[PDB]
Structure 1
């Protein structure tokens, strides 16, 4: 289901890439996308899939377009257009200067200072989860770790019931990796139905949790509106529930297949941080976009007002012009170049938290379970979308090679 090519589009710029179901999926999701960067592919393509939209294929263009909010508006950041349109999250669906007051409040909630306060819990949960798995000699890493670890931390931060996870997680997933089961607007509303009463409650009676702080915040000197708070909290949820979770499964699938990479990290822990960045570059997973505010000519291509463009953050650090031998994982790259957390005014406030969680996982897993692999005859499936993911991750190990801490 291809949409008819609009008049302004040169047919030589056509490359029908399905962000929800790319052709090379079996190879790995990063590998499916990376098709976009082959020699046969122009820098700026038009896809007839998912209603028709441009895609920038190179790090140089992606960065440029991210910097340029004047032309590339966040007002409609998701594809398909109906999704982009229903999209009302704060501060993500706003351009500067309006975005700033909101970002500033989001940052109070998820920023460094919060990470620093949550450290011991992050550590405590990881060690608790891993120690619990260790003696088993096998898990479902996605379900057994990647999901609980980050989500239980977020639930704790937000002051929400762990019981709500399954419902919440389903809804967040419909938004990034739609099933057809629900439209975006519907998923969005259900999430909002959830949030509304909570916000009310926290406006009347303030906690110290993330939601209580957002609900009672000041922005441009006056108090945040209930609708505003609902719109920030909605984003905080998708961020917390759908990001780190997918990231850890890609990284663990790689560690499982690469003993040499595991060893390195065991012997020379001083490299953990560097390895983390390199994993963030290699297993990049987010792709959203922007909307043209007007007619514009970008790198010789005519963009029309209202066109959407996908600016795949995942792609920048996969770009040969940015990284020599991109698909190769090398812990000692002189320069790890990526835009994994985005670029421009919308750079991820949740990045400090995301790194702390990744570094603790790596440190803590490798300590106790140094030797593991993917289960004999399990087939690892990737899933593509706004945020890509791994279906299931069956791991096996010999209990006897583990170390109790």
Structure 2
């Protein structure tokens, strides 16, 4: 279902990409998006799918567009439009200077200082989960680790019951990788229904959990409102539940198929931080966008006020103009160029958290299970959307080649 081309769009700029169902998804999600950076594709295209919107395809344009809040507003950041209209998360549906204060708060809950505090539980949980898996010689990495690992840690942070997981997860998934089962609005309302009660409770009877801090926070000198907190927590939730989860699977899928990469990490462990970057570059997985606030000519293309543009965070690091041999994984690249965690004012707050989770996983996994692969005759399926994912990851290994710690 293609939407009739608006009059301001030149035909030569049309490239019908479907962010929710890219053509050669079989080849992998990143490769599927990379079609956009082939020679036959202009830097800025219009797709008729998902209601019609612009896509910027080069590191350079995405970076610029992200800097330019004046022109490119976070107000309606999701495609399609109905979803972007419904989106009211804080601080992401806010432009500076309004953004600034909410950002400072969210930072209190997720910043460096919190990561630093939780470091021992992160390490504790990863070790616990790996050790538990080790002797089985087989898991479902997505369900067995990638999910519980980050999730349980967020739940700890949030002070929410692990009992809620399955439910929260269904709803978050509905937002990034729509099923068809529920609209964005519908999904958002249900998450909101979950949070309302809890927020009220923590406004009265505060604790030390992230939710308690957000609920009782100060913004622009005054007390945050109930609605505002509901809206920030909505963000925290999506962030805790939906990002690190998918990334881990992509990384692990890769590590499963590259003996030589695993080995490099085992002998020269001082390279783990470098490799984490490179993996973040190569298995980049978020794509959102901005809304034109007014008519604006950008790189010779005339954008009209109200036009939505997708600026794929995933795409920067994959652009050959940014990194030579972009689909190649090189842990010793002199310069790892990406915008996996965004660019401009909205730069991911949770990045420190994400980095710790990844790095721990890599060291702790390789220590114990150095040798593993994908279960024979497994068809590994990726999924596209706001946050791309791996459907399942069947891994197999010889218990005898493992190391108990």
Q: Same fold (TM over 0.5)?
A: yes
The separation in 1 between residues aligned to 2:141 and 2:270, in whole angstroms, is: 25
Offset, 1:200: 0.1
1:289 alignment partner, SS class? strand
Offset, 1:34: 0.1
Match of 2:376 in 1: 376
Offset, 1:311: 0.1
2:309 alignment partner, SS class? strand
The separation in 1 between residues aligned to 2:113 and 2:16, in whole angstroms, is: 44
The separation in 2 between residues aligned to 1:210 and 1:21, in whole angstroms, is: 35
The separation in 1 between residues aligned to 2:379 and 2:96, in whole angstroms, is: 45
2:310 alignment partner, SS class? strand
The separation in 2 between residues aligned to 1:287 and 1:64, in whole angstroms, is: 15
The separation in 1 between residues aligned to 2:310 and 2:42, in whole angstroms, is: 15
Q: Deviations over 1:265-323 (max 9, x none)?
A: 00000000000000000000000000000000000000000000000000000000000
Q: Deviations over 1:12-62 (max 9, x none)?
A: 000000000000100000000000000000000000000000000000000
The separation in 1 between residues aligned to 2:225 and 2:177, in whole angstroms, is: 30
The separation in 2 between residues aligned to 1:55 and 1:8, in whole angstroms, is: 15
2:344 alignment partner, SS class? coil
The separation in 1 between residues aligned to 2:301 and 2:116, in whole angstroms, is: 46
Q: Deviations over 1:39-87 (max 9, x none)?
A: 0000000000000000000000000000000000000000000000000
RMSD of aligned Cα (Å): 0.2
Offset, 1:203: 0.1
Offset, 1:256: 0.1
Q: Deviations over 1:169-195 (max 9, x none)?
A: 000000000000000000000000000
Match of 1:389 in 2: 389
The separation in 2 between residues aligned to 1:313 and 1:291, in whole angstroms, is: 16
Offset, 1:124: 0.2
Offset, 1:339: 0.1
The separation in 2 between residues aligned to 1:24 and 1:336, in whole angstroms, is: 26
The separation in 2 between residues aligned to 1:187 and 1:278, in whole angstroms, is: 34
The separation in 2 between residues aligned to 1:294 and 1:17, in whole angstroms, is: 25
1:290 alignment partner, SS class? strand
Gaps of 5+ in 2: none
The separation in 1 between residues aligned to 2:195 and 2:31, in whole angstroms, is: 37
Offset, 1:255: 0.1
The separation in 2 between residues aligned to 1:233 and 1:24, in whole angstroms, is: 35
1:352 alignment partner, SS class? helix
The separation in 2 between residues aligned to 1:263 and 1:379, in whole angstroms, is: 25
The separation in 2 between residues aligned to 1:43 and 1:80, in whole angstroms, is: 21
Offset, 1:224: 0.1
TM-score, normalised with respect to structure 1: 1.00
1:143 alignment partner, SS class? helix
1:15 alignment partner, SS class? coil
Offset, 1:139: 0.1
The separation in 2 between residues aligned to 1:207 and 1:135, in whole angstroms, is: 39
Q: Deviations over 1:102-150 (max 9, x none)?
A: 0000000000000000000000000000000000000000000000000
Offset, 1:384: 0.2
Q: Deviations over 1:356-376 (max 9, x none)?
A: 000000000000000000000
The separation in 2 between residues aligned to 1:49 and 1:269, in whole angstroms, is: 45
The separation in 2 between residues aligned to 1:383 and 1:105, in whole angstroms, is: 33
The separation in 2 between residues aligned to 1:316 and 1:162, in whole angstroms, is: 36
Whether 1:106 aligns to 2:106 is yes
Q: Deviations over 1:336-383 (max 9, x none)?
A: 000000000000000000000000000000000000000000000000
Gaps of 5+ in 1: none
Offset, 1:240: 0.2
2:237 alignment partner, SS class? helix
Match of 1:251 in 2: 251
The separation in 1 between residues aligned to 2:190 and 2:245, in whole angstroms, is: 22
Q: Deviations over 1:233-252 (max 9, x none)?
A: 00000000000000000000
2:289 alignment partner, SS class? strand
The separation in 2 between residues aligned to 1:319 and 1:169, in whole angstroms, is: 32
Aligned length: 405
Whether 1:312 aligns to 2:312 is yes
